[PDB]
Amino acid sequence: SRFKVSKLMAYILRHSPWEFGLEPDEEGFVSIEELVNAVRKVYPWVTEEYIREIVERDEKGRYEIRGNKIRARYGHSYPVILRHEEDKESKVLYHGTVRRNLKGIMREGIKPMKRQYVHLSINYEDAYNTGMRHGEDVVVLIIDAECLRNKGYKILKAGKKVRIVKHVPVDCISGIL
Ligand SMILES: [Cl-]
Ligand SMILES: [Cl-]
């Protein structure tokens, strides 16, 4: 199914490409042809056309293809530089987290998890679902995006609904829930 195959591509492209004989470039890209061969190690009926279709109809925009290269657009557990086009338009963004993080955040702003990017959402609902990954007691931080831009931070369009930024100073957090 597209769900199973996409789950496997997400794992390969974000977390364990070398286990499959793939070597991503600095931007997280691998050969889509080698990705097909890798995926076929698990799902032998997968075609390059199928993976291109998964990318095209992925509801979150998780993936990006350029010529023969394919990457996950965000969520990597290894070093990548992501030169996504800038979100210049959003005025308020959202960050899902858990209540016990508030103390730390109120001290030092939102810092990345070594990832070098903080994940924000354009929608409260998706920020909430994202925060639910780290526990049940979820709070959603309202983020002033103009405040971020004024301080010099560039907000990038990582996915259809995901936005990434280097850091969120306390000053730019305007509300909770
Ligand atoms: Cl393997
Ligand atoms: Cl990321």
Curated annotation (Swiss-Prot):
GO molecular function, one term: tRNA 2'-phosphotransferase activity
Enzyme Commission number(s) of this protein: 2.7.1.-
Keywords: NAD, Transferase
Domain of life: Archaea
Pfam families: PTS_2-RNA
GO biological process, one term: tRNA splicing, via endonucleolytic cleavage and ligation
Purpose of the protein: Removes the 2'-phosphate from RNA via an intermediate in which the phosphate is ADP-ribosylated by NAD followed by a presumed transesterification to release the RNA and generate ADP-ribose 1''-2''-cyclic phosphate (APPR>P). May function as an ADP-ribosylase.
Recorded family membership: Belongs to the KptA/TPT1 family.
NCBIfam families per the UniProt record, alphabetical: PRK00819.1-2
Protein name: Probable RNA 2'-phosphotransferase
Gene field: kptA
